[PDB]
Write a protein that binds this DNA or RNA. Structure first.
Ligand SMILES: [Mg+2]
Ligand SMILES: [Mg+2]
Ligand SMILES: [Mg+2]
Ligand SMILES: [Zn+2]
Lengths: 38, 349, 126, 141, 131
RNA sequence: AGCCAGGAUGUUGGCUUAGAAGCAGCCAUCAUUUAAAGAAAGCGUAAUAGCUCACUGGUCGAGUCGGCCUGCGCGGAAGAU
């Protein structure tokens, strides 16, 4: 999990979701890509 | 092939055994060993191929000499012609090999005194003539005169393209036996001169003051300064993390001045700690290369009464001294390079 | 295979005595190369190398730390043998039974050592 | 059809079996024997030439028995002796190393038309001069 | 993708072939292989040459648009992928039946021996070709 | 958008290096059958092998895809009685 002020899609499998008012990135391929904005 | 023949035969045997080693699938399991064998195989292969061809030509030469009732002359003549041609080809193909940078030549007198100076002058003249008949550049850096003759010690810097690869073997001690110029009688005298050849190297300084690897402590000063000095952090101490030098300052009232002065002193110390290390390394290398002039630890000998130059590393004697002293010492260098390269190929255990 | 050497090299005689006796006992064979006289103990498994130092310290008074000489598969052997012996000398050693053995480097580097000769090179002594 | 099971599709110049590192370890970890290629791989090449590089496949079944089939040499080495130069380019755009005319491209086509697909011999030559273009050969008129 | 322009080209080139052609078949080879397909076309073309218009453009309104002249009842091939194959020289040529040997040759899928219907044929094999 | 299938033929590319075979880097980047297929966008080997993607054929049945000008909101945002 990367906590940063600038979250982007890295691979083609990353997705942008909003969960309880917080933006975060999840992809099914590489668990190195999941991020949250903070 | 005086002596290199045995080494090349052993080299061929090594080529055969690595042929065997690269077909087992067990030495293939580990990859460092397989990589090393594959790397070393190529020079083994081509040199061994040439050596086997020369061996076959030689065993052809041996045959047909003990035969009569036929004009053996022309075919053996062409056989020895192609034999010599193949030998020259192998020499030129395996002698060479990198390091081709310019060189520093320092030659100084040893045993003998006022006559070792004269021989040092003669030896330097030889080397300078060799450099000149190569379109190289020679300039003198340091010189100490030898009273009666040439130089007690002369340090020059020879500049070209491939100087070191040829002049690296001229280091050690050189012995001369002759009737000197500083002699009232007709006695023959022995003396020696020490030669050091080193490569020229870059000395790129780095400002090892990276502000990311410093520990800076600020605290109160110690001494007489009244009320101001008590409630103020005006004293600095800087620690260099890798090197370990710690320098501190309380000279001035301002913190910034203390930091500047202490940082400058730290830089000076870290620079001196590098100069005073490379200097000792270079001094040790020059001491271990230079030998010690004692007319008993020498790499080659010159004899003017017999007009003979001999090399003790490879036991090579030639009666062309008068040619060598004029700067034709390329015939004293080629065998050394060839045999050293053969040795370097051998040292692959 | 491993190489054995002690901490006070002034106690070589006791090392030889202990090694020959413990070689009489079980299966710890001893080799001394034709050159540079450095002992090599060849056991059947690893724990022998432990118990040998354990006894050599407990009963005798030598320490004898180990080395890691590379070798595998020693093989025992008129003028027919003599000529090979003088030809290939750096790889021949004496046992503790004063026999002769050919210390190779690897089995692949041993076949070429027997492909060139009419020598039986049987190993298991008589 | 049998796909890649335990084999590799390569081999060195076929004139001699030469159990050298370029060919030895290539089948080293697959087992089999290396010298026995001589009676199976050098007799066939004794027809054509010695030392020319041609490709084969070393299809091996798990029985440790090797079955192999040859084919025409690659155009990379076939456009060397006909081109008259052993070596090749590597800066083809800036400078060229050799010359070649449309006279001899088709003459090597049938020697390679056994499996090289194409509509006709002439169209097969377009691919030949396409590979020749990047090899630094100059088209000669 | 093709815009509205070369869709005409996929028709204009194609329409001229059913006019001068003969008994033609189709094949639903959803899993063919290009090395197999290299032999399929080039063996059948080897007899005369590039006379195969064996293209694969069988959309319900991209191959049917070439039908309204001839093979009218063959227009019912609109469903899943197929492949036309025409012959100008040789009426009722092997092109229907040389797929049958291809069927045994790792092409079990061959659209169930239908072909076109000029003589109003059926789902059956016509292997006749007199010599 | 999903879902089935193909994703190839002469580069074991000279150049380079022990091997660089689509994929370390240096140069070009044509051509065959194509319905499409890069002289290769990514993964994976010592090198191969192997897995995806570019592109295309089929199913389903109609809306879908990014930008520009603008109003208000979200994150970025941690202190001591
Ligand atoms: Mg005061
Ligand atoms: Mg005693
Ligand atoms: Mg805000
Ligand atoms: Zn991702």
């Amino acid at each position: 999990m990367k906590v940063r002020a600038s979250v982007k899609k890295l691979c083609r499998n990353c997705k942008i979701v909003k969960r309880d008012g917080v933006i975060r990135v999840i992809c099914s391929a590489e668990p190195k890509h999941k991020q949250r904005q903070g | 092939k005086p002596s290199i023949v045995a080494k090349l035969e052993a080299l061929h045997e090594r080529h055969e055994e690595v042929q065997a080693l690269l077909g087992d699938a067990q030495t293939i399991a580990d990859q460092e060993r397989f990589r090393a064998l594959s790397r070393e195989y190529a020079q083994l292969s081509d040199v061994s191929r040439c050596f086997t061809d020369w061996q076959q030509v030689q065993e052809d030469i041996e045959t047909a000499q003990m035969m009569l009732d036929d004009p053996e002359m022309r075919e053996m003549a062409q056989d020895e012609l192609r034999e010599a041609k193949e030998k020259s080809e192998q020499l030129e193909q395996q002698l060479q090999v990198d390091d081709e940078r310019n060189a520093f030549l320092e030659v100084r007198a040893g045993t003998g005194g006022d006559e070792a100076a004269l021989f040092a002058g003669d030896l330097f003249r030889m080397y300078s003539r060799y450099a000149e008949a190569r379109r190289w550049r020679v300039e003198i850096m340091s010189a100490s005169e030898g009273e009666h003759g040439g130089y007690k010690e002369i340090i020059a810097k020879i500049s070209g393209d491939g100087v070191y690869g040829r002049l690296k073997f001229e280091s050690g001690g050189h012995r001369v036996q002759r009737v000197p110029a500083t002699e009232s009688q007709g006695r023959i005298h022995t003396s020696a001169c020490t030669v050091a050849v080193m490569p020229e190297l870059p000395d790129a300084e780095l400002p090892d003051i990276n502000p990311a690897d410093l520990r800076i402590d600020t605290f109160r000063s110690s001494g007489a300064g009244g009320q101001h000095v008590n409630t103020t952090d005006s004293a600095i101490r800087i620690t260099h993390l890798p090197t370990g030098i710690v320098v501190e300052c309380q000279d001035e009232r301002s913190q910034h001045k203390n930091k500047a002065k202490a940082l400058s002193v730290l830089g000076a110390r870290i620079h001196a700690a590098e100069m005073a290390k490379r200097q000792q390394a270079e001094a040790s290398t020059r001491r271990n290369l230079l030998g010690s002039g004692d007319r008993s630890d020498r790499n080659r000998t010159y004899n003017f009464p017999q007009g003979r130059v001999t090399d003790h590393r490879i036991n090579l004697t030639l009666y062309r001294l008068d040619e060598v002293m004029e700067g034709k010492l390329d015939m004293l260098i080629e065998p050394i390079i060839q045999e050293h390269q053969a040795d370097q190929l051998a040292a692959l255990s | 295979f491993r190489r054995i050497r002690l901490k006070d090299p002034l106690k070589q005689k006791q090392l030889l005595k202990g090694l020959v006796q413990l070689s009489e006992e079980g299966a710890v064979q001893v080799f001394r190369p034709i050159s540079n006289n450095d002992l090599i103990v060849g056991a059947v498994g690893v724990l022998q190398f432990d118990v040998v130092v354990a006894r050599l310290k407990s009963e005798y008074n030598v320490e004898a730390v180990y080395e890691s000489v590379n070798v595998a598969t020693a093989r025992w052997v008129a003028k027919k043998f003599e000529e090979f012996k003088r030809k290939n000398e750096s790889q021949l050693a004496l046992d503790g039974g004063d026999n002769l053995a050919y210390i190779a480097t690897s089995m692949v580097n041993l076949r070429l050592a027997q492909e060139r000769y009419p020598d039986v090179q049987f190993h298991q002594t008589r | 059809a049998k796909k890649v099971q335990a084999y590799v599709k390569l081999q060195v110049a076929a004139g001699m079996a030469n159990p050298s590192p370029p060919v030895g370890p290539a089948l080293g970890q697959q087992g089999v024997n290396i010298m026995e290629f001589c009676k199976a791989f050098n007799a066939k090449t004794d027809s054509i030439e010695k030392g020319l590089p041609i490709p084969v496949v070393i299809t091996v079944y798990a029985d440790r028995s090797f079955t192999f089939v040859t084919k025409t040499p690659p155009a990379a080495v076939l456009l060397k002796k006909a081109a008259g130069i052993k070596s090749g380019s590597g800066k083809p755009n800036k400078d060229k190393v050799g010359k070649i005319s449309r006279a001899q491209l088709q003459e090597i086509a049938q020697t390679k038309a056994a499996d090289m697909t194409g509509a006709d011999i002439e169209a097969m030559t377009r691919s030949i001069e396409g590979t020749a273009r990047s090899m630094g050969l100059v088209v000669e008129d | 993708m093709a815009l509205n322009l070369q869709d005409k080209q996929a028709i204009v080139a194609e329409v001229s072939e059913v006019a001068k052609g003969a008994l033609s078949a189709v094949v639903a080879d959803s899993r063919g292989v290009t090395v197999d397909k290299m032999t399929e076309l080039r063996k059948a073309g080897r007899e005369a040459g590039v006379y195969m218009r064996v293209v694969r453009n069988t959309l319900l309104r991209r191959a049917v648009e070439g039908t309204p002249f001839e093979c009218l009842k063959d227009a019912f091939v609109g469903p899943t992928l197929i492949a036309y194959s025409m012959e100008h020289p040789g009426a009722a040529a092997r092109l229907f039946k040389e797929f049958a040997k291809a069927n045994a040759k790792f092409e079990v899928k061959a659209a169930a021996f239908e072909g076109e219907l000029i003589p109003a044929s059926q789902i059956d094999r016509l292997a006749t070709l007199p010599t």
